[PDB]
Antibody, heavy 216, light 220 residues
Framework: QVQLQQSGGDLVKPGGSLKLSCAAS????????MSWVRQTPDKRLEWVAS????????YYPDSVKGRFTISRDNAKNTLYLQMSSLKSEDTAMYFC?????????WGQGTTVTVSSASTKGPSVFPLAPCSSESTAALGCLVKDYFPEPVTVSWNSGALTSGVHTFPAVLQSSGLYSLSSVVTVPSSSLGTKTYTCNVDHKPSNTKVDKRVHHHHH | DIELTQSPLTLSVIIGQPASISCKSS???????????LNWLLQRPGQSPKRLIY???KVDSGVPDRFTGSGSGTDFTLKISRVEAEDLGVYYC?????????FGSGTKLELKRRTVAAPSVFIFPPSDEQLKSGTASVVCLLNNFYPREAKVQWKVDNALQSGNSQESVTEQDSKDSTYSLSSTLTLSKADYEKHKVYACEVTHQGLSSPVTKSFNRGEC
């Protein structure tokens, strides 16, 4: 199973530097060119860098030339992107991809946010109604974090049906907030428990919150 | 640089109907080697891009025959004979032949339903944990509705609220082509304790009349 596991998202000041890593497994790493592709906040895709299988040839668009360096460790099966003199335009989700140009496999992505603001970890709050009785709803409010992203799962990934995790909103404070909810038949409330798993890697925050069926 | 332009930018298709996505290149993209190198990506919501077609017409293994790629010269086309649930997401074309490698801006495919789906409406009071920190967030949830257009109005003691709430909408659900929406009303704890009735009023084509969900801060 081809696998490209990338480093966590991170905040960098303008002009700052950062090194991203992508650990590959499940294929002959030393036989493939590798690439970095980024997705900007407007969801456009932009090629960032490519490297030949052995590392002799590196390729860059003019927008990053002299600032970014792509490298690879064929013993560790790891791909790197050293970023420097970072600009606000560099804010994006950076994907590690197999092949130089014909991207057959993609990593999960690393969010890089270039800004002067400081990191803030989220507060996680339960969402539960005060009380049709067919469907019931429980949730988690993930409030006031920076930068993006947070990831949310339920019951350590065992629960996927009925889960709605909303896109984050930017509050007037400059902090992000997001909610995730589960909608279940009311009969399920009797015997099942519902726990939201929240991860904010930029602040090293991991929280599991069991949400109770009634408000206190 | 080779510019790739896609059309349409937003694609709404009734389930089962064909759909076509166009990708136009500023220059031709036939190199030497007599090879294509125009590719198509699908990015499903919250997922990594997955290649569907890497040349003009070569379909990646595991992709149904409904997806076909065609074209040559400056204009390229991706066709889905029958649009199914798993086809929703953003489609990108790109060329990996010549530096710099370039992508199209992306085409969002959304599913169109023949019948409406009404939202299930829930309201959530602020948690005691949050109230201790000096803020109160009230959440209104509209679950599994269609069309996307919906009006959410917050009322606090019958006063219409403006400027103190934010909405988020999930991407279209694969299973039934419905949306879900979250609206969060954010108040200070001091302000929250000064009022009694918190209500979310929803207008939607799936509702015969506007539905109001409410709670009383004390009576909970």
């Amino acid at each position: 199973q081809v696998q490209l596991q990338q480093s966590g998202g991170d905040l960098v000041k303008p002009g700052g530097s950062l090194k991203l890593s992508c650990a590959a497994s499940g294929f002959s790493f030393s036989s493939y060119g590798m690439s970095w592709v980024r997705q900007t906040p407007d969801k456009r895709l932009e090629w960032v860098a490519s490297i030949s299988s052995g590392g002799r040839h590196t390729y860059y668009p003019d927008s990053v030339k002299g600032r970014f360096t792509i490298s690879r460790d064929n013993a560790k099966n790891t791909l790197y992107l050293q970023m420097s003199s970072l600009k606000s335009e560099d804010t994006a989700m950076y994907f590690c991809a197999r092949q130089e140009g014909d991207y057959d496999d993609w990593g999960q992505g690393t969010t890089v946010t270039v800004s002067s603001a400081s990191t803030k970890g989220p507060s996680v709050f339960p969402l539960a109604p005060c009380s049709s009785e067919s469907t019931a709803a429980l949730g988690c409010l993930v409030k006031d974090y920076f930068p993006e992203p947070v990831t949310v799962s339920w019951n350590s990934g065992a629960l996927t049906s009925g889960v709605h995790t909303f896109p984050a909103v930017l509050q007037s404070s400059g902090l992000y907030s997001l909610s995730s909810v589960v909608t279940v038949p009311s009969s399920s409330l009797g015997t099942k428990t519902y726990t939201c798993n929240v991860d904010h890697k930029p602040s090293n925050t991991k929280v599991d919150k069991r949400v109770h069926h009634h408000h206190h | 640089d080779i510019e790739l332009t896609q059309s349409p930018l937003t694609l709404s298709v009734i389930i089962g109907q064909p759909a076509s996505i166009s990708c136009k290149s500023s220059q031709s993209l036939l190199y030497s080697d007599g090879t294509t190198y125009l590719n198509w990506l699908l990015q499903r919501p919250g997922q990594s891009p997955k290649r569907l077609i890497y040349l003009v017409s070569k379909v990646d293994s595991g992709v149904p025959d409904r997806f076909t790629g065609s074209g040559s010269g400056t204009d390229f086309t991706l066709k889905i004979s029958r649009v199914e649930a798993e086809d929703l997401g953003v489609y990108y074309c790109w060329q990996g032949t010549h530096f710099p490698f370039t992508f199209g801006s992306g085409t969002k495919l959304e599913l169109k339903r023949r019948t409406v789906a009404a939202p299930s409406v829930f309201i959530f009071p602020p948690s005691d944990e949050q109230l201790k920190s000096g803020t109160a967030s009230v959440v209104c949830l509209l679950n599994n509705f269609y069309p996307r257009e919906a009006k959410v109005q917050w009322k606090v003691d019958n006063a219409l609220q403006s400027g103190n709430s934010q909405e988020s909408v999930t991407e279209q659900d694969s299973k039934d082509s419905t949306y879900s929406l979250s609206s969060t009303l954010t108040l200070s704890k001091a302000d929250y304790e000064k009022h009694k009735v918190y209500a979310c009023e929803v207008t939607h084509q799936g509702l015969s009349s506007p539905v109001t969900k409410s709670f009383n801060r004390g009576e909970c």
